[PDB]
Amino acid sequence: ASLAIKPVFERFQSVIITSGTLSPLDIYPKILDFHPVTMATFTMTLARVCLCPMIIGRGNDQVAISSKFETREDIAVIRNYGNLLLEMSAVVPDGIVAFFTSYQYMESTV
Amino acid sequence: KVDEYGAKDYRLQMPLKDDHTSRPLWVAPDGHIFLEAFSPVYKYAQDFLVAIAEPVCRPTHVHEYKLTAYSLYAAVSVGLQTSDITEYLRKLSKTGVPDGIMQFIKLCTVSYGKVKLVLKHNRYFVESCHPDVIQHLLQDPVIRECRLRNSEGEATETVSFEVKQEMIEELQKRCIHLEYPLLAEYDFRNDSVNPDINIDLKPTAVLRPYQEKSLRKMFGNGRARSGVIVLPCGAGKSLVGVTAACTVRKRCLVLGNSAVSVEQWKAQFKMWSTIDDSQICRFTSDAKDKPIGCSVAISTYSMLGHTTKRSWEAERVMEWLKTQEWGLMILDEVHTIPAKMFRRVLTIVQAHCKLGLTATLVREDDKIVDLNFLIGPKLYEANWMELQNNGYIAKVQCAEVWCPMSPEFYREYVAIKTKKRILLYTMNPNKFRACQFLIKFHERRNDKIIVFADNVFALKEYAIRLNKPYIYGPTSQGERMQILQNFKHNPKINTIFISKVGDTSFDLPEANVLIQISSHGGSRRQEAQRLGRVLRAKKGMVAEEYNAFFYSLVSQDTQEMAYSTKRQRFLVDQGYSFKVITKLAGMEEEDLAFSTKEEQQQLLQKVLAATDLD
Numbered sequence A: 001a002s003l004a005i006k007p008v009f010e011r012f013q014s015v016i017i018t019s020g021t022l023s024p025l026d027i028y029p030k031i032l033d034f035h036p037v038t039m040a041t042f043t044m045t046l047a048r049v050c051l052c053p054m055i056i057g058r059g060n061d062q063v064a065i066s067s068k069f070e071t072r073e074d075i076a077v078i079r080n081y082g083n084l085l086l087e088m089s090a091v092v093p094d095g096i097v098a099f100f101t102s103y104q105y106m107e108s109t110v
Numbered sequence B: 001k002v003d004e005y006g007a008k009d010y011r012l013q014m015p016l017k018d019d020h021t022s023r024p025l026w027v028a029p030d031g032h033i034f035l036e037a038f039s040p041v042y043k044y045a046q047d048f049l050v051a052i053a054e055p056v057c058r059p060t061h062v063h064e065y066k067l068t069a070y071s072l073y074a075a076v077s078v079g080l081q082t083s084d085i086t087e088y089l090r091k092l093s094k095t096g097v098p099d100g101i102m103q104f105i106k107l108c109t110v111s112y113g114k115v116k117l118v119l120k121h122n123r124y125f126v127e128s129c130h131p132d133v134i135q136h137l138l139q140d141p142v143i144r145e146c147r148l149r150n151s152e153g154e155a156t157e158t159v160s161f162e163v164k165q166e167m168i169e170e171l172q173k174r175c176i177h178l179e180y181p182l183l184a185e186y187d188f189r190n191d192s193v194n195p196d197i198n199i200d201l202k203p204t205a206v207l208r209p210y211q212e213k214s215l216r217k218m219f220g221n222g223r224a225r226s227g228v229i230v231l232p233c234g235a236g237k238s239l240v241g242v243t244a245a246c247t248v249r250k251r252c253l254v255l256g257n258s259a260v261s262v263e264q265w266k267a268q269f270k271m272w273s274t275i276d277d278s279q280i281c282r283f284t285s286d287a288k289d290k291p292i293g294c295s296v297a298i299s300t301y302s303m304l305g306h307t308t309k310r311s312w313e314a315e316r317v318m319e320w321l322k323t324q325e326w327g328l329m330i331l332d333e334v335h336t337i338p339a340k341m342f343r344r345v346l347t348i349v350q351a352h353c354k355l356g357l358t359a360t361l362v363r364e365d366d367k368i369v370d371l372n373f374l375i376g377p378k379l380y381e382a383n384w385m386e387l388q389n390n391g392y393i394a395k396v397q398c399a400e401v402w403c404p405m406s407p408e409f410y411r412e413y414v415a416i417k418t419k420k421r422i423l424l425y426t427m428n429p430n431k432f433r434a435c436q437f438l439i440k441f442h443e444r445r446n447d448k449i450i451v452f453a454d455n456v457f458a459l460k461e462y463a464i465r466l467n468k469p470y471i472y473g474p475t476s477q478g479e480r481m482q483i484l485q486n487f488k489h490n491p492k493i494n495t496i497f498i499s500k501v502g503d504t505s506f507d508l509p510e511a512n513v514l515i516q517i518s519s520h521g522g523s524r525r526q527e528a529q530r531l532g533r534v535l536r537a538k539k540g541m542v543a544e545e546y547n548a549f550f551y552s553l554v555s556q557d558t559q560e561m562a563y564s565t566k567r568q569r570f571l572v573d574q575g576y577s578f579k580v581i582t583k584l585a586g587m588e589e590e591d592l593a594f595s596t597k598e599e600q601q602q603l604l605q606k607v608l609a610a611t612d613l614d
Helices: A002-011 A026-034 A075-091 A101-110 B042-050 B069-078 B082-092 B099-111 B131-138 B141-146 B166-176 B209-216 B235-249 B259-273 B312-323 B339-348 B386-390 B405-415 B421-426 B429-444 B456-466 B477-489 B526-533 B559-573 B597-609
Strands: B025-027 B033-038 B054-057 B062-065 B115-120 B123-128 B229-232 B253-258 B280-282 B296-300 B326-332 B351-358 B378-381 B396-403 B450-452 B496-498 B513-516 B548-555 B577-580
Touching: A002 A026, A002 B253, A075 A101, A101 B351, A101 B548, B025 B082, B033 B042, B033 B386, B042 B082, B042 B229, B054 B378, B062 B421, B069 B099, B069 B477, B099 B131, B123 B166, B131 B141, B131 B405, B141 B166, B166 B339, B209 B229, B209 B378, B235 B253, B235 B259, B235 B326, B235 B351, B253 B259, B259 B296, B326 B597, B378 B405, B396 B559, B405 B421, B405 B597, B421 B456, B421 B559, B429 B450, B429 B513, B429 B548, B429 B597, B450 B456, B456 B496, B477 B496, B513 B526, B526 B597
Parallel strands: B229 B351, B229 B378, B253 B296, B253 B326, B280 B296, B326 B351, B396 B548, B396 B577, B450 B496, B450 B513, B513 B548
Antiparallel strands: B025 B033, B033 B062, B054 B062, B115 B123
């Protein structure tokens, strides 16, 4: 893909690249085959904690939650996801979004 | 020294130090240990005591533990030496540790882990790192007979020697006499003769913290060690056994009381283990499977202990089992093992690692001292009250209801002095009315009712008059299963009458109300295990401390009072309370059978008609 961006680096004065999902700062120079002048990540300072990221790898029955294709067809994982969604609907406010891994898996789960 | 009041004057032998509140333990020189639960170091003290001391009583506040040689051997097998144990005891004992207990610990620990028994090539070898002990033990006449000898009678020559299989259990008792107990050590990872099996643990299986602790204690230094683990009924004991079998990865043998236990174990293995069904075989009298490729075999003790001539196929299966070397063996309901026929099964079967699981170990015949060497020391025993607090099991509401004896029955009760007297108090019309009122109340409350009665005649009469299903000796298995399914699914029927067969002959469906009318005669452990198996945790009433109901109908001023008092001792030692109920509220308003005294006279006529034959 770097070829598609290769002339842009070699013709314009500078290129500005920014995104909210830039966890590795070194793969992109490798992906685009170039050496950016500055590679800086701006840490977010909050007076009030607006985000509460949580990881739930265990279901109600302590089932090991995984999204591997071997475990995607597991009925227990689907039931745990359904119970989690039910509790979230009964607890969390109206806005609920759930991102699955594939369309077929989502349809089977539904 | 004994005081005039009977208290043992242990003040002189126990030097008290000023660290009273911080140290929670009292260590009397008699071997008993007292622990206070309200102490902040209770959890650490509880963990230390469980590892080294066998509990005696665990009520709410003060727990009493006992120190035994088997417990010391188990602690040594865990990996604890004398120095650390002594240091921890002195750090926790309110008074100084008496030297008598100190010398008792020193003597036992040094003698542990000396003699080793190895089962290789279907042959038993006794070897040790100290040939002087081996040479000394040769002089014993019992050991001479137990030692295997050549076909000409010549004795066979860390040097090991073959030992007769038929004399293995005899050698186990002789080790106690020689004070050199055997070591049940198995090469968990160094095993090469027995290949591994494609069996793993499903992710749906979750090990509770006490279960994981018990398993880790059993797996001393990563090696499986033979022993006994005591867990309450319904606490996933079958799940623990399946997990242990998966961890072992070697050939597995499981033994149950009846075919129902075999089916339950097979279902649990399919539910939690990854072993293929082709490698799972049932050596039962009706449903038989080919022993070829049988990675895990599930059977019953009586099937392996059938002294009478067996079927031709069963003989072939037994021959294959004897030829096959079993890395792991699993035994259920260890309390029946002390029977001679079931003990002979241990000699018959050649297994490396043997693990026994049950709910109780207090045999009324106290044949447990030999059991400590038949399998091994008790590896773990969970606290019933603690698991109730954790919510793993239902917090049972126990009550003893005293049913007054009718004067007509009472005079005949005193008149009769033989064994026919059981029918008189087991058929109390007042007890019948109390049971009827309880059944009505629990049906109005929509509760599952299980009425247990050892007496066949009394159980049948109660079930017939109350018009409820009855389970007794024959109880054709198809009809039994139909009745069980009706109890589980049909809301109209929620009361099942079960005879003595309800202890272990089949699986008990989850219920909430258990009423015991008839007693075995002092089965302090059998009925306790039955009660544990009947009642399980029920969702919805977790917050309430009374979610499971147990009632014991006892005839006043009869010998049933003594039987109940003797039986409930085991449960009281577990901290279970028992409230005496003489008056039942609501019986006056509700209409019950035998309201008129002439009906009770008719019941007396019926009972007297049932002679001593019944």
